[PDB]
Design a protein around this nucleic acid. Structure first.
Ligand SMILES: [Cl-]
Ligand SMILES: [Cl-]
Ligand SMILES: [Cl-]
Ligand SMILES: [Cl-]
Ligand SMILES: [Mn+2]
Ligand SMILES: [Mn+2]
Ligand SMILES: [Mn+2]
Ligand SMILES: [Mn+2]
Ligand SMILES: [Mn+2]
Ligand SMILES: [Mn+2]
Ligand SMILES: [Mn+2]
Ligand SMILES: [Mn+2]
Ligand SMILES: [Mn+2]
Ligand SMILES: [Mn+2]
Ligand SMILES: [Mn+2]
Ligand SMILES: [Mn+2]
Ligand SMILES: [Mn+2]
Ligand SMILES: [Mn+2]
Ligand SMILES: [Mn+2]
Ligand SMILES: [Mn+2]
Ligand SMILES: [Mn+2]
Ligand SMILES: [Mn+2]
Ligand SMILES: [Mn+2]
Lengths: 92, 105, 78, 96, 95, 86, 103, 96
DNA sequence: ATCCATATCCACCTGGTCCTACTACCAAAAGTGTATTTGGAAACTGCTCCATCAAAAGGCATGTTCAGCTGGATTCCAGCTGAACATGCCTTTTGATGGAGCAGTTTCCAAATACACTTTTGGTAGTAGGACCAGGTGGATATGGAT
DNA sequence: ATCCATATCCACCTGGTCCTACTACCAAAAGTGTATTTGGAAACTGCTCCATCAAAAGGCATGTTCAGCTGGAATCCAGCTGAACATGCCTTTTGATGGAGCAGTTTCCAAATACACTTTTGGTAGTAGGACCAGGTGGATATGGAT
């Protein structure tokens, strides 16, 4: 079986443009984009943990990695969404 | 009971992101918070991209997003263009741009 | 088969690039540049193909080759 | 007649900047990649999507290179790209 | 008074292209680094070798950039580098 | 523990220093505006790098920027540096 | 008896193995991988040290300084490509005046 | 108070130095550069091998992955010479 | 300003490429609950090296003058390249189809991991002691350039 | 061709710097042997999709002719920038000090892992049904440029 991010990309699409569809090739580009940014952030965090002689990747390493990778407004908005998600997650 | 995505109020998978971080050998261990933060950042980025792309689709009177709409969205946003500066979208074309040197008269 | 790129094709690519006039010695130059490009990427691709002990070059091999060239490509996997 | 040299040119600039289709014929390109690959390992086969991906990457690379080349020509206060422009570009990009 | 305009410049090219010493003054560069860094985060000290690393990196970058810039000027049939040259080089580099 | 205010230190990158750097790049003649342009260029180059550096610093919960922070910043920027660690 | 001498190498096979598993490149690391990698590393260092030693001898020196490494890698097409995105501290640049600027 | 034992490649590249130029020294900064070069090439090769393993759904870094990684990274003759040294050292190691 | 020849654009239409949707099936994934393990945060502190101070010497930045040759403006024309056209060759298309070979499944052993006991080794440290590199002075010889 | 003025250079030294070289201590690699676990090589093969060969139809490549206008060569001069020079500042250098804060060590406990048992889910494959758009068709109208 082959795993994809397609159904979640579609969930967010209907969440943000309810009457808008998406062609299959565009969805494949979206899945490649998600996998790409995933590998970039995860690799940046991995290196971050290595440089500080640490064995665990916390949400903190993910945050610093995001600040390293994303430009500016994207970085702060994404940091915001992430820390919001972790706080709302640990409150339950 | 409820998916960890719902615990973080997220559409993107928390369990899957945790498993892929688990198998990427990025470190020996990953804390419980990291996958929900990463899923949140990913969902945000896809949300921004799909937003701008949706705008580009409506501008050309189109119901569904095709690759060109993604290319216009990325290349017209300074931030996302910077993020995807070394990425090629297939069947995306280029921005309409004639150098103001060989124009009329 | 490098002569396959018919001068109108170069010219169209250049129009998409945003050029107005094209010298008569642009076409063979473009031929050479395209040749070294395809040589590098295809070499890496079929190296990935050999490591997988296969005889078919997959789309994923081209995606990996391009990715390590610094020319990441969305639209075909990965 | 009816048009002065170089306005149908801009017409083509707009035509192909509006669109996304590939601009090299697909089979001559496929022959090209088969030839080039035949010199690294023999008796090789290609997934159709592999040749398609190579064509997308090749045309993208060439279009960007023609952008920088055009910039080089305009910098010398000319409007016709010349191989010296392609070479100056590829030199500054680090491809040399 | 003796040499004509230009040849002393070729002398300086052969000279600085023969050696390796850093060419920006040390303390002005350190002050610039501390100013720039002070706008990102307050109370930031530096290992001396960190300022030296930033200086080595900066001068290498600027020297390479001047090479590309010179190529651009020569491409425009000039021998004088101008801001349009630096801008064309940084643009084609994707900076 | 009062410190003076750091300002305008980009002008410490003298026109002589920029001339030297141009000479090592093989530049023969330099127009009068180059210098300011150069500083502008230099400024952004430092800014970027220094950001990432102090980011690493901030992630290590340290207050001194180490040579290794600069080396990691430069490597990420795609300008790997040999001679200070790593 | 060490694996380095068993592999006929000066570079440390054991350290390359441990460092190999300390970076998490895969779940497992076969015993040939650190031997091969240590052999390749030793070869590359041998090459650069050879050309750089020639450089120091050219400028009548007795020990290699960073400039000699710079001339070594910048004058070899292949090493220059391998280190094309690398900056050698205190290496300087190669002598190169574009011809049109000459008398 | 038991300072961190910082490991280098210095004594090994020094051995290799006297094997090729027995009368030449190396300055401390040039040595530091050499250690940086070795750790760099190490990270690039091991990274490529890791990516290969993950691409082929494998959890083992064999000397094969190291080999084709070397072929991907090193240019031309360097690759062929390095590959030959890797094969020789492996056969000698598996010979005892 | 007039008019002709294309090129461009908006509206409407129609076939088929392409979406979503809804059913079922299900291995894998994801969650849960229970038990053991451990990375690394806190607290303390030994001590490296970073900031800052003073002092003084001269290397080098700054500000100015002056004139050489460079860039940029102008003019011209040779010939290079774009436009348009007729021809006709290929590319495209799509269709069927062997069969190469990618990929799914299973067996099973060479090789990797785990752990414990034994050596070996590589840094770190200090102290001695030489080679050699940097820089200062001086005195041939070249060389760019004015004649 | 002559020759001045200044830079270049070669040959040494000598002061201090920076490298190799000794002994020794030694935690922490690194080797080793044993036992236990398993990744993926090999072997078989079922289904995908890749290659190839056929057959039209016209889209678009090729080759030519012919004219406009663009590149490049030549000429001219305002003025921008290089070279030289006088002045003195503020960088470099040496050395000392106080203490920030880095980094080493121990304690402990919150969070991570390990494992088994259960519940949910995404995703795969068919199979219905519909809208969306690609490509014409028609005729209005804007546009380029020659009168
Ligand atoms: Cl966490
Ligand atoms: Cl040319
Ligand atoms: Cl300018
Ligand atoms: Cl192995
Ligand atoms: Mn400030
Ligand atoms: Mn034998
Ligand atoms: Mn219909
Ligand atoms: Mn512990
Ligand atoms: Mn001129
Ligand atoms: Mn004419
Ligand atoms: Mn078969
Ligand atoms: Mn020892
Ligand atoms: Mn010396
Ligand atoms: Mn000397
Ligand atoms: Mn002495
Ligand atoms: Mn198994
Ligand atoms: Mn002109
Ligand atoms: Mn004048
Ligand atoms: Mn303290
Ligand atoms: Mn479901
Ligand atoms: Mn249409
Ligand atoms: Mn019509
Ligand atoms: Mn008109």
């Amino acid at each position: 079986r082959k795993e994809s991010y397609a159904i979640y990309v579609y969930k967010v699409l209907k969440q943000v443009h309810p009457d808008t569809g998406i062609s299959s090739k565009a969805m494949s580009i979206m899945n490649s984009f998600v996998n790409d940014v995933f590998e970039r952030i995860a690799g940046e965090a991995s290196r971050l943990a290595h440089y500080n002689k640490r064995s665990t990747i916390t949400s903190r390493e993910i945050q610093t990695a995001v600040r390293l990778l994303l430009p500016g407004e994207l970085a702060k908005h994404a940091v915001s969404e992430g820390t919001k998600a972790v706080t709302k997650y640990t409150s339950a | 009971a409820k998916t960890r995505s719902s615990r973080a109020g997220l559409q993107f998978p928390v369990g899957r992101v945790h498993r892929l971080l688990r198998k990427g050998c990025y470190a020996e261990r990953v804390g419980a918070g990291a996958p929900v933060y990463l899923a949140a950042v990913l969902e945000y980025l896809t949300a921004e991209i799909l937003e701008l792309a949706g705008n580009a689709a409506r501008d050309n009177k189109k119901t569904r997003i095709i690759p060109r709409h993604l290319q216009l969205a990325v290349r017209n946003d300074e931030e996302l263009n910077k993020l995807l500066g070394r990425v090629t979208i297939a069947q995306g074309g280029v921005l309409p741009n004639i150098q103001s040197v060989l124009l009329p008269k | 088969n490098i002569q396959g790129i018919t001068k109108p094709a170069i010219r169209r690519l250049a129009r998409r690039g945003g050029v107005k006039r094209i010298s008569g010695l642009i076409y063979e130059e473009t031929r050479g540049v395209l040749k070294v490009f395809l040589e590098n990427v295809i070499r890496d691709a079929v190296t990935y193909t050999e490591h997988a002990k296969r005889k078919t070059v997959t789309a994923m091999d081209v995606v990996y080759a391009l990715k390590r060239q610094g020319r990441t490509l969305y639209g075909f996997g990965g | 007649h009816c048009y002065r040299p170089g306005t149908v040119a801009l017409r083509e600039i707009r035509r192909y900047q509006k669109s996304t289709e590939l601009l090299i014929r697909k089979l001559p390109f496929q022959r090209l990649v088969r030839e080039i690959a035949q010199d690294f390992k023999t008796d090789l086969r290609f997934q159709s999507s592999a040749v398609m991906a190579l064509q997308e990457a090749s045309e993208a690379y060439l279009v960007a290179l023609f952008e920088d080349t055009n910039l080089a020509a305009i910098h010398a206060k000319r409007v016709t790209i010349m191989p010296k422009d392609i070479q100056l570009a590829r030199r500054i990009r680090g491809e040399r």
